[PDB]
Amino acid sequence: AAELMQQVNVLKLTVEDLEKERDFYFGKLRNIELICQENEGENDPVLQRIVDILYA
Amino acid sequence: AELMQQVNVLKLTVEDLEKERDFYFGKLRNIELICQENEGENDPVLQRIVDILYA
């Protein structure tokens, strides 16, 4: 059935897209984490609060 | 014959990927809120983080 095949192909596109979005948001989180790690020494408590969110 | 297995398998993958995506986005939104609360601080490290959020 062509309807089923189209549905499959559509889902495939959707999977690729969601994967892209997921990696896109995760990438931001990772870069943010790295920045917080660089500033562990400094007394900037907001960064620790950002860190807590990352590990939540 | 033709198999409906693919559809159901892909649908599970879609829901699992959506969950992960929404999970990471939620954190980003939480972080955006923390930065918005500290706008007056004019913190250079926060500014860098803010730029990443909106990149």
Partner: peptide
Amino acid sequence: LRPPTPL
């Protein structure tokens, strides 16, 4: 950080 599950 919870790493994204691999496909």
